[PDB]
């Protein structure tokens, strides 16, 4: 029973292997996108509220929203639902997915931590990784730096320094749009 814990305010998701039915019984008979306090699986997880964001089966079939079952059913998946990207436009295919309520027969349980508790998880809640590259629209940087009106918008851009071995040093700035 793999656990893919992921706490979005810092990223740094990690895979967790736990093998006790007692500790993970707190998840059973819960739908996805339902926030359940994950205090059952050890002392380190006290004060935490986690959200079930989906998972996979024994055979690797992912879990889909709204199915409302425990098992595998076939759905005529159109464009843009989930678990399916069309090879060509307008293409729909019948694919097998997993219902939203979670039970024992899962390989990995993707999780999202909603609120922070009392202490820091080593390798999860520390070492804040930054989001890679900043906004590209004019108003989308004006909001982010609280610009009122056309105030030096050229020089509030997020210039990206880059360094490699053979790279002569150089900063990168994006073509702002709109």
């Amino acid at each position: 029973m793999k656990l893919n814990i992921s706490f979005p305010a810092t990223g740094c998701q990690k895979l967790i292997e736990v093998d006790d039915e007692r500790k993970l019984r707190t998840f059973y008979e819960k739908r996805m996108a339902t926030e359940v306090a994950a205090d059952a699986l050890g002392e380190e997880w006290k004060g935490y509220v986690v959200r079930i964001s989906g998972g996979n089966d024994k055979q690797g079939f992912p879990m889909k929203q709204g199915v409302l079952t425990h098992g595998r059913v076939r759905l005529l998946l159109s464009k843009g639902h989930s678990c399916y990207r069309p090879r060509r436009t307008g293409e729909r295919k019948r694919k097998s997915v997993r219902g939203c309520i979670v039970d024992a027969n899962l390989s990995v349980l993707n999780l999202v931590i909603v609120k922070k508790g009392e202490k820091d998880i080593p390798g999860l809640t520390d070492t804040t990784v930054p989001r890679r590259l900043g906004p590209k629209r004019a108003s989308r940087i004006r909001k982010l730096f609280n610009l009122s009106k056309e105030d030096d918008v050229r020089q509030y851009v997020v210039r990206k320094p880059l360094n490699k071995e053979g790279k002569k040093p150089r900063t990168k700035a994006p073509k702002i749009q709109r």
Binding site: A9, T128, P130, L133, G134, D151, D152, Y156, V158, R159
Partner: protein, 116 residues
Amino acid sequence: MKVELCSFSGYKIYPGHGRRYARTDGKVFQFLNAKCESAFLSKRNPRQINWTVLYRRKHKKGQTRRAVKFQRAITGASLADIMAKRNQKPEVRKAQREQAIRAAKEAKKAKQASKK
């Protein structure tokens, strides 16, 4: 205590109770008693049978707004960097406005002299 089974009615079938029916098309069914099996073999929908679990759930017998944003650093602009660059509100932004305007003003005058 074996692996449990559920019936037409959805009731738990404890071991040593009821019967199991396997159809030719490869499906297997199990029934708690002969009442459930006589309802099933009559092709009755258990949703219209008042004492079955499906009817209880279909008729629901027996039984907010959230939006949070957080701030993160960007590769090339740390949290201190962005929070400093977003906190020139006491007139410093107007200083940058006016200084860019005057710089563009000598640029404009040089263009106006070298154009006509």
